[PDB]
């Protein structure tokens, strides 16, 4: 048992009545001075390591070029100048274990945390020396956290894509289906998660060209995909992981959800293959009133009226579906197949809830697209547009295929540091940079998409740890208003900086001028509500930082009426698995799951308290089972409604918990605003 | 949580001897040199004699003392799997292979020998110290059957995997497979057995059941270890089916809640060759706030 | 002389209650009285209850004190019908066909029930008073196993015979017939066992053995004439059954090989209508033609 | 019950200790005469009926367009001049269910026999109507029969390819992986089967760039195929069916045998997806001598030398392989992996086994490729160039993937007419014609192929049909020399008729000129060995009928010489499976599996009597189950010296013979020159 190990596990040791959470610092120092001094690559100079590590295939000779040695050693300077320590044994841990540069043998470290900054801001700056400082500072202080692919991957010779998340729109085309597949294995070869859109795809039983009731449906394109994903495994490294979407009103909707029951059989059920449901408001309305539904056939109605049945608003267009005898359904109970969504919930965590309605009424390219899905951790919600992707010697008419680059804002070093500012617009711009430096050569819808929608997801993370270490309970009423001021105020500065961004480049994103950006639309409720804080406690948590007032916004939709607006999605909260752990922050926005967490690694079990858990704060770290779901359902929307895209919730739920209290939940969840639900854990 | 479950994997994995045709394992064995002939037959009187024990006292012993009739009944199903299916089907390899008198021979030295005697009356001594209405004792007898059933099986089934990885003995190897199958699922069955025991105990005792399973596991581990060069040394296999031990060792832990021992171990491709909350409807109101 | 052939016999008949399909019965049992469905689902409850008693105490506790490794398979093989495959079944036909309400309150009225507890504690206390080597419990035992088999389950069956014979719930009389068919080889083979003890014995000791065995009968008669009463006056069946439980102590006397006791009556005529390619290695010389 | 099957069934009722094989003539007489004429639609005239089937999307009105419909009405009294009769109810019966023309709903009958012989000869003549009713008389008297796919769908609109049989070379490539699914969903679709070679695919174990132990290997990719073949179903009346071949020197040759083992796991074992391996003489030589042979890794090897395993000659790089450090290898016994072999084809009859020094000593086309892997029905033998399908934004480099058009000669009713040249002639044409108004859009490789090689199969049957009505054994010498006699003037005459066409237009096969027809080495045998029948009882047979001598064969190499080839490939002989009860013909040159055939279609019991079968010839009329192997394969090797692709050769096994049996056969086939085993059929 290693030292650092037993130092680690003596926490749960009570002594005095209490855990000795100061073991943890004990734990990690014995870990760095026993282990990672030990087995760290040292060299005489940077240079030297500079070299090593450019030859021997490490790094990228083309973006440390860019630099001369002098600027690239006081970048290296300004990462060590801070003296940063790791506080916990599982921060140094898991960035040793999954970021930092190892031997090809895996058995020496070539990269410190220092390095790994270093070589992540010189990345991020192209050429910049004092960008490159500023991106230091921003990262060592650990107030922004790059995503896993661009903290992991940035300056690495052998390195998958920056993008992890990508959603592609499948057509109701044998060449489209078989084009999915291969860009599924393409993108889960470069190792991101692949969210395919399934709605457009007729139904079961019918018709292909004259030959009726042929089709196997969506089903038999999942089998494909989950095979797909399965054999593209990312170099047997880690799993091949995908997503499915279908909406609620495809007739497939109860073969779809079928997929994931426990006792699906083989040839129906799915491994590797998350499922998204998308729910627009008709469904919601037809439960609501418990009027018998109708699921629909994509292919009668796109015969009947040349769109896709997605393609449509199904406020408008469900009547008119009913009505139309040469459209094909069959009835359906909406608060059945609710029931059932609660079940499938409870059973196995899916399928994932996208309230279509909720995402469209905010959303501000509904003139390019509607959002239709979402990504694999449902977060990301853009306008797509589907490929028709012909004959080997005709030419496809390739569409947009969303993929955006993910970026964390860690709340507590922000709010401490005052700077919520500055690192949200230095975050923009090294979004911007993984964004024009991201060329995937198999995609060319997602590739089209990221040249022409420029969107980047700009996340959080820490709000739980924040607020616990500043006296806040997570369901109180004062969390949510330092969310919504906190929320705000980065909305402000990430439209502020893509519209300076905009006015730099002198381009938009395209078809901006058709967005509510361009019109002001977007602005109504920022230039018409005042949102700094409504509690003397919070007011307090934001002294020394100028939070933006009704003029203020006014301002800024001047200026972006003016100079137009870069990126056309700015901010999504992703969940932030591992990099929280590095960062020693909660994951995302959401509450967390235990105080105290119970990992065992290899052989030995390791202890992880929540970052900031003391005596004092014992209570206000309340973990999430343990809360009221209504609760962070309104914490949720507090946030959702300065969030461009969505946000990865997580639905923690309790034994006890019925199909009628997550179905209560859900619809709790569509009436606050809610734009999509994650996961249903229960404890 | 558990029982009906075990039930129907258990009733669709019934089969029996008569199904698999032997004879034409006559066409190989004659192949093989005599410490090889000699090892098989040692290997199969080993798990013979151990099979027995757990059909006649084993099983029907768990059976007697846990409370339950659906537990009761699975495990009586598998009593009859040992006594009905598993004797029958070793009984019919021996006299496919051998001349009774030799099949005589083999039994009294394998009935004579130090390692398989070691085991055997280690595992039968557990058995028989089970007290009525004491939870204690019967955890540790359903310690004894797991690494029966998970673990000391394996240094015996070990050869019959061999030959069937390679091509040889077929029949009787396919035979052995299905009650590797069997003893698989009997392992986890009883391993889920004594877990809710260990779960129902005080933390000390917990620690002084844990002490008491790892002590065992060592002292039958030790005991296997020689069993294993007396048999295998001889056709120069010993080293490998060492890994294969441990690996099984492992596997019987992790049935009995435990962590695993040994380190990981890759195991011989030829061997390897041869192996719900509660639905409640929403009754409106629940769509407004 | 007869071991082997039982063997054979019992894992050849070998069945699951899953072969039978019982939603084919829904619509005989939904036409029938409530009167009808009371005494039918209290029947195979009754049923049940002996049942599991063999597969849990009856069959294992005799495997357990009778000689012999091939007799043990066999009794063994018929503890697990009791309790895996027989008692079951019933669960199935009762999940079919009543909601659970009415299935908890009939598990319920087997608990409460007089003659029921009654026929289970003598029954019951006969298996649990055999003492190791001491063949005359064991013949006691054996002597109420097969009262159990050819006698006491008759007054259950003769309502699902009754019911076949007519045509109605023919799927649920299937798996009875099944059971039957069962029950009667289990009683022999018991029988013959029992036989064998009281053969041992001196002219004294067999008359004594006469005198137990045909006070049981009386006392497990007497008993079952209340039962019967009680379960069937409500359909106008008890003099019907009466008769065909008397012609089955009949031939649990002859089981045991004692004269009939009682006289010949006519049963219900209904009830009587309701009665691989062979691996070969490769020569050198396959190779050249 | 139908009256037409209980006179059927009073075939088996044994009256005078004799079967009653003429109660099929009045079966298939109360067949028509009680359910073909009532529900045959019959029009006041033919041209009422043309254009009511070219009105309703029945036929194509391109094809028709080329003749005045004097023309077609002269052909089609053609057709009706013969007054062709069914002999039995089978043949009838097979023809109205599975070819014959149906209206839109299945309910009543369009085309008669004699209709869809002159829309098939029209078809084929394309505006010459001397030339269809060449073809008419040639269908008509059934001297040439059509495959299934050309004879069920040429002239109909909605109609799927006229090819069936299709092969493809998939590289080591994600790309190529992914292009492979694809282009067999698209063959599949069209109603085709798909043959793919798996052998340039590397093994499992081998690096993805740098990184080890990360290709899943062949079987990943078969997964990948099998799922793609049971999504492409065509409803799933014919579900998608796959071959893949592995060389027995592929690394992964026993995980590819695994997946058709009956204890196989469903994450492993293929269910849709046949094998095939390729043993060149080399593994049967190491096997011979019992040495350690060694199965290596594709990609080792192709880093090592540059090209792939199967495109080097294993007699001669074996040994570099063995004793090259840089390629990575497994010991294996090469007995035991026949001995496997041997066990899995007595289980499943899997693999196919194709003798590849057999099929490439022999080969025509070595210039251009040797021939590396089988069709599905493993008689398709031709050269193929693997393609390299690259990113979306590059361009495809397209190879060449196998397909031709197959056709069977009717050997009885050849021979009975004395037409063997014109036959062959004709049938030439034919499939010349098939060839080139074939065009597979979604298939490059077979597409440039089908332009470039211009191959066609023609094929025969009722070789034991012929012989037993005709007083010879299937395994006596006489039907060998009759079979040998046949199928030299059947190569003769085919390689004639391509001369002519390369002559008439003026043009060969892509790289002719390098192949053994330019060189003059193919006609060897021809011009010193004489063909003609050794016995009198077989020169009868001839008589009446020119057989080419040696001068013949000298004055056909000159012709040759001096006006090419047409064709690269002529003559495969495939299983011809539903056409051989129209046909009256015994299936494909393989001898009968039974006398008497019972079959159950739907509810119904009926019996099929081999054509002609009588008691004058019952013992000739042997069944392939009671006649040694060892001289059917002397037969097939007989008949395949004049057959330049493979014959369907189906191993007809005893339950009694072991696998040491099926090795013997096996091996005495490669002795003996054969080519291919299709199937070990086990009674
Ligand atoms: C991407 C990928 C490839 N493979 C296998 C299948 C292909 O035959 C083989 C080649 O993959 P490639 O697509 O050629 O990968 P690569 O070009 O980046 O690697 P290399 O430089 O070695 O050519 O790898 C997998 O097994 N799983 C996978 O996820
Ligand atoms: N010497 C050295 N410095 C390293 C290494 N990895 C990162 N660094 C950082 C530490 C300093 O901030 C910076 C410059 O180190 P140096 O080349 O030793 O500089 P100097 O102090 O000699 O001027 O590089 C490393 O491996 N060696
Ligand atoms: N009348 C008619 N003839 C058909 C039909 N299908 C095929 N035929 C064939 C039969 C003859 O050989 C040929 C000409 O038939 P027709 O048009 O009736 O001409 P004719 O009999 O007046 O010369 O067409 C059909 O449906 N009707
Ligand atoms: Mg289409
Ligand atoms: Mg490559
Ligand atoms: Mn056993
Ligand atoms: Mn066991
Ligand atoms: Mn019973
Ligand atoms: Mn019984």
Known sequence: ?683 | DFTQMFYNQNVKQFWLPEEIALNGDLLTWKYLGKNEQDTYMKVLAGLTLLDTEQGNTGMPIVAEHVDGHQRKAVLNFMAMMENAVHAKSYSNIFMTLAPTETINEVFEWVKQNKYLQKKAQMIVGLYKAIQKDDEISLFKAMVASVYLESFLFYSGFYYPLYFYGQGKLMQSGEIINLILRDEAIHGVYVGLLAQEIYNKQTEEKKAELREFAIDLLNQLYENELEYTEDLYDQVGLSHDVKKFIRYNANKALMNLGFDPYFEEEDINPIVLNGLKATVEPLKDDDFYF
């Open chain 1, 1 to 683: 048992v290693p030292k650092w190990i037993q130092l680690n596990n003596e926490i749960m040791i009570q002594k005095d009545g209490k855990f000795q959470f100061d073991k943890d610092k004990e734990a990690v120092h014995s870990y760095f001075v026993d282990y990672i001094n030990q087995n760290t690559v040292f060299f005489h100079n940077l240079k030297e390591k500079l070299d090593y590590l450019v030859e021997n295939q490490y790094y990228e000779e083309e973006f440390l070029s860019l630099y001369s040695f002098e600027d690239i050693k006081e970048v290296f300077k300004t990462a060590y100048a801070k003296k940063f320590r790791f506080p916990s044994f599982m921060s140094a841990f898991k960035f040793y274990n999954d970021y930092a540069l190892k031997t090809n043998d895996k058995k020496k470290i070539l990269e410190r945390y220092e390095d790994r900054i270093s070589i992540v801001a010189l990345f991020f700056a192209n050429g910049d020396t004092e960008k490159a400082k500023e991106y230091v500072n921003l990262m060592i202080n650990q107030e922004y956290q790059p995503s896993t692919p661009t903290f992991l991957n940035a300056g690495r010779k052998r390195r998958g894509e920056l993008v992890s998340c990508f959603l592609l729109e499948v057509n109701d085309s044998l060449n489209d289906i078989s084009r999915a597949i291969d860009i599924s294995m393409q993108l889960s070869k470069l190792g991101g998660g692949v969210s395919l859109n399934l709605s457009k795809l007729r139904a079961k039983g019918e018709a292909i060209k004259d030959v009726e009731n042929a089709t196997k449906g969506v089903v038999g394109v999942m089998k494909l995909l989950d095979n797909a994903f399965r054999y593209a495994d990312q170099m047997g490294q880690r799993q091949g992981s995908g997503a499915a979407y279908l909406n609620i009103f495809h007739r497939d909707i109860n073969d779809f959800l079928d997929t994931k029951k426990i006792s699906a059989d083989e040839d129906v059920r799915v491994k590797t293959l998350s499922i998204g449901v998308v729910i627009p408001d008709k469904f919601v309305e037809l439960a609501r009133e418990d009027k018998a539904a109708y699921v629909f056939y994509p292919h009668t109605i796109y015969k009947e009226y040349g769109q896709h049945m997605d393609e449509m608003d199904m406020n408008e267009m469900y009547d008119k579906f009913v009505d139309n005898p040469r459209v094909k359904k069959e009835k359906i109970n909406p608060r059945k197949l609710l029931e059932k969504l609660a079940m499938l919930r409870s059973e196995s965590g899916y399928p994932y809830i996208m309230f279509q309605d909720n995402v469209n009424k905010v959303h501000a390219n509904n003139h390019i697209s509607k959002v239709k899905f979402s990504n694999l951790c449902s977060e990301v919600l853009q306008a797509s547009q589907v490929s028709s992707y012909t004959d080997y010697d005709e030419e496809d008419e390739i569409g947009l295929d969303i993929s955006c680059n993910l970026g964390s804002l860690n709340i507590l070093n922000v709010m401490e540091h005052k700077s919520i500012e500055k690192t949200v617009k230095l975050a923009t711009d090294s979004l911007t940079h993984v964004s024009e430096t991201t060329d995937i050569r198999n995609a060319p819808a997602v590739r089209r998409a990221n040249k022409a929608m420029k969107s980047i997801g700009l996340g959080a993370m820490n709000l739980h740890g924040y607020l616990a270490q500043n006296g806040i309970a997570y369901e109180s009423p004062e969390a949510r208003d330092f969310a919504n001021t906190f929320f705000m105020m980065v909305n402000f500065y990430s439209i502020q900086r893509s519209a300076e961004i905009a006015k730099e480049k002198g381009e938009t994103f395209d078809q901006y001028e058709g967005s509510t950006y361009a019109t002001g639309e977007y602005f109504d409720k920022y230039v018409s509500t005042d949102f700094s804080p409504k509690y003397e406690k919070i007011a307090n948590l934001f002294e020394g930082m100028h939070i933006p007032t009704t003029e203020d916004w006014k301002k800024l939709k001047a200026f972006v009426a003016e100079h137009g607006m870069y990126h056309s999605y700015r901010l999504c909260i992703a969940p932030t698995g591992s990099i929280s752990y590095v960062q020693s922050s909660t994951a995302s926005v959401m509450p967390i799951m235990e105080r105290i967490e119970e990992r065992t690694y290899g052989n030995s079990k390791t202890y992880y308290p929540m970052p900031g858990l003391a005596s004092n704060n014992w209570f206000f770290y309340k973990e999430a089972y343990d809360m009221d779901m209504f609760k962070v359902v309104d914490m949720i929307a507090t946030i959702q409604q300065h969030i461009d895209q969505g946000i990865s919730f997580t639905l923690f739920l309790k034994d006890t918990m019925t199909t009628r209290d997550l179905n209560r939940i859900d619809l709790y969840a569509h009436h606050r605003g809610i734009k999509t639900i994650y996961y249903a854990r229960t404890k």
